[PDB]
Motif scaffolding. Structure first.
Motif, short mmCIF file in Angstrom:
data_model
loop_
_atom_site.label_atom_id
_atom_site.label_comp_id
_atom_site.label_asym_id
_atom_site.label_seq_id
_atom_site.Cartn_x
_atom_site.Cartn_y
_atom_site.Cartn_z
N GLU A 160 -5.83 -2.19 13.03
CA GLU A 160 -5.28 -2.86 11.86
C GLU A 160 -5.97 -2.45 10.57
N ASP A 161 -7.32 -2.48 10.56
CA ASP A 161 -8.19 -2.10 9.44
C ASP A 161 -7.84 -0.72 8.89
N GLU A 162 -7.93 0.33 9.74
CA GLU A 162 -7.62 1.72 9.41
C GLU A 162 -6.17 1.91 8.97
OE1 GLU A 162 -9.64 4.85 12.17
OE2 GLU A 162 -10.61 2.90 12.52
N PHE A 163 -5.21 1.25 9.66
CA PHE A 163 -3.79 1.32 9.29
C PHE A 163 -3.55 0.74 7.89
CE2 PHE A 163 0.20 -0.91 8.77
CZ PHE A 163 1.12 0.12 8.82
N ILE A 164 -4.12 -0.43 7.58
CA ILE A 164 -3.97 -1.09 6.27
C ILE A 164 -4.36 -0.13 5.11
CG2 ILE A 164 -5.06 -2.89 4.81
CD1 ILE A 164 -4.54 -4.65 7.67
N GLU A 165 -5.51 0.54 5.22
CA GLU A 165 -5.96 1.48 4.19
C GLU A 165 -5.07 2.73 4.03
OE1 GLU A 165 -8.71 0.12 2.25
OE2 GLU A 165 -7.51 1.47 1.00
N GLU A 166 -4.62 3.32 5.15
CA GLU A 166 -3.84 4.55 5.16
C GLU A 166 -2.36 4.39 4.76
N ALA A 167 -1.83 3.16 4.84
CA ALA A 167 -0.46 2.83 4.47
C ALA A 167 -0.19 3.11 2.98
CB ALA A 167 -0.17 1.38 4.80
N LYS A 168 -1.25 3.27 2.17
CA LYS A 168 -1.19 3.59 0.75
C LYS A 168 -0.67 5.03 0.58
N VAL A 169 -1.25 5.99 1.33
CA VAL A 169 -0.88 7.41 1.32
C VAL A 169 0.49 7.64 1.94
N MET A 170 0.82 6.88 3.00
CA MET A 170 2.09 6.99 3.72
C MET A 170 3.27 6.56 2.86
SD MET A 170 1.08 6.08 7.69
CE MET A 170 1.35 4.32 7.49
N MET A 171 3.08 5.55 2.00
CA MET A 171 4.10 5.05 1.08
C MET A 171 4.42 6.03 -0.07
SD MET A 171 3.67 0.89 0.85
CE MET A 171 5.05 0.55 -0.25
N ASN A 172 3.43 6.88 -0.48
CA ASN A 172 3.61 7.91 -1.52
C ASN A 172 4.46 9.10 -1.01
N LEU A 173 4.62 9.22 0.34
CA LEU A 173 5.43 10.23 1.01
C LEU A 173 6.93 9.81 0.98
N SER A 174 7.71 10.40 0.05
CA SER A 174 9.11 10.06 -0.12
C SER A 174 10.07 11.27 0.01
CB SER A 174 9.33 9.30 -1.43
OG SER A 174 10.66 8.82 -1.53
N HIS A 175 10.52 11.53 1.25
CA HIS A 175 11.50 12.56 1.53
C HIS A 175 12.69 11.94 2.22
CE1 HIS A 175 13.23 16.44 2.57
NE2 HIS A 175 12.66 16.78 1.42
N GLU A 176 13.91 12.34 1.81
CA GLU A 176 15.19 11.84 2.32
C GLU A 176 15.35 11.95 3.83
N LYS A 177 14.64 12.87 4.50
CA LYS A 177 14.77 13.08 5.95
C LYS A 177 13.54 12.57 6.72
CE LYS A 177 18.88 15.07 5.27
NZ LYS A 177 19.03 16.53 5.00
N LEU A 178 12.86 11.59 6.11
CA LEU A 178 11.68 10.91 6.63
C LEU A 178 12.00 9.41 6.59
CD1 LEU A 178 9.05 12.49 7.37
CD2 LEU A 178 8.19 11.93 5.13
N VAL A 179 11.68 8.67 7.69
CA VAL A 179 11.95 7.23 7.77
C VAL A 179 10.96 6.54 6.84
CG1 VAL A 179 12.18 5.12 9.19
CG2 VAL A 179 12.99 7.31 10.09
#
Ligand SMILES: CN1CCC(c2ccc(Nc3cc(-c4ccnc(-n5ncc6cc(C(C)(C)C)cc(F)c6c5=O)c4CO)nn(C)c3=O)nc2)CC1
Length: 264
Positions: free
Chosen positions: A45-64
């Motif tokens: 949970e700890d590691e996921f919470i921090e990394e979700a910041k970088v994952m949200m900046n990833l915006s491509h139409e063929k990515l969920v």
């Protein structure tokens, strides 16, 4: 980045994933979302919470697209894009669809476009398979749950010997040295291309998980699927060079798939 849990509305059960129950809902009563309900002790949970910041900046139409998180609750929730037709592997096995090879080639392009985006963002998926790809209402194929393998607490999934480990989508340096790279995701793409043109057939179908790792080392690669052209197979085969440095990039592979459809 945080989403209000009461702003969500549970409507239907979309099945089980690595982190438990997945459901279909609506954000603010108008926009469609998928809610992954994280099961107790399944995620870092700890590691996921921090990394979700970088994952949200990833915006491509063929990515969920990950719309946000509900982290001030137990179980924690992950709000993502809703894909009406579900899992790509399940969609490929439904005989009713009666796919043209042009459709299967288009599916590859959708995964490749997303993967070149992830390559240009120096982001690894780490578990690229058809089971981790989704299909929306328009029949658009999108790359799902990228990088979440890092937060899986489950022993049978993390270990290269485990029953859940992605053995068949893994190159020799991964199975043997645990050498993950851009080229390990590149090997997985060739396996995904094979799954598409094989119509959801299991790679190394005759073999057991243990027997798969032995043959992969000996140099045994997947055969030419019945629906695959000679030119299309050259692309999936180029991903499986023994020397990882000899395998191409998602940029090259994208150019490869697009030249093949102009010459389809
Ligand atoms: C008859 N019909 C009834 C409905 C059915 C159907 C099924 C479904 C549908 N949509 C969706 C369904 C889902 C969905 C549902 C259940 N399980 C998973 N799943 N699978 C693998 C997975 C792997 C990992 C690692 C770390 C990489 C190993 C981590 C994960 F968290 C997961 C995970 O959560 C997912 C994918 O998010 N999501 N999303 C966005 C959807 O949109 N939509 C329709 C299709 C057939």
């Amino acid at each position: 980045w945080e989403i209000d849990p009461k702003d969500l509305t549970f409507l239907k059960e979309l099945g089980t994933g690595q982190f438990g129950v997945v459901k279909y809902g609506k954000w603010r009563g108008q926009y469609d979302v998928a809610i992954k309900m994280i099961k107790e002790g399944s995620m870092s949970e700890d590691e996921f919470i921090e990394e979700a910041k970088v994952m949200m900046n990833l915006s491509h139409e063929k990515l969920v697209q990950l719309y946000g998180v509900c982290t001030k609750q137990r179980p924690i929730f992950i709000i993502t894009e809703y894909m009406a037709n579900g899992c790509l592997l399940n969609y490929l096995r439904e005989m009713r669809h009666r796919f043209q090879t042009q459709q299967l080639l288009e599916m590859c392009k959708d995964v490749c476009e997303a993967m070149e985006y992830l390559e240009s963002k120096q982001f690894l998926h780490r578990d690229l398979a058809a089971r981790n790809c989704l299909v929306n209402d328009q029949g658009v194929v999108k790359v799902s749950d990228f990088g979440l393998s890092r937060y899986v607490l489950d022993d049978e999934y993390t270990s290269s010997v485990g029953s859940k480990f992605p053995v068949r989508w893994s190159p020799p340096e991964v199975l043997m040295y645990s050498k993950f790279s851009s080229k390990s995701d590149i090997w997985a793409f060739g396996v995904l291309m094979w799954e598409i043109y094989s119509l959801g057939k299991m790679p190394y179908e005759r073999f057991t998980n243990s027997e798969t790792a032995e043959h992969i080392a000996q140099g045994l690669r997947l055969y030419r699927p019945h629906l695959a052209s000679e030119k299309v197979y050259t692309i999936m085969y180029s991903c499986w060079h023994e020397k990882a440095d000899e395998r191409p990039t998602f940029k090259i592979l994208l150019s490869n798939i697009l030249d093949v459809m102009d010459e389809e």
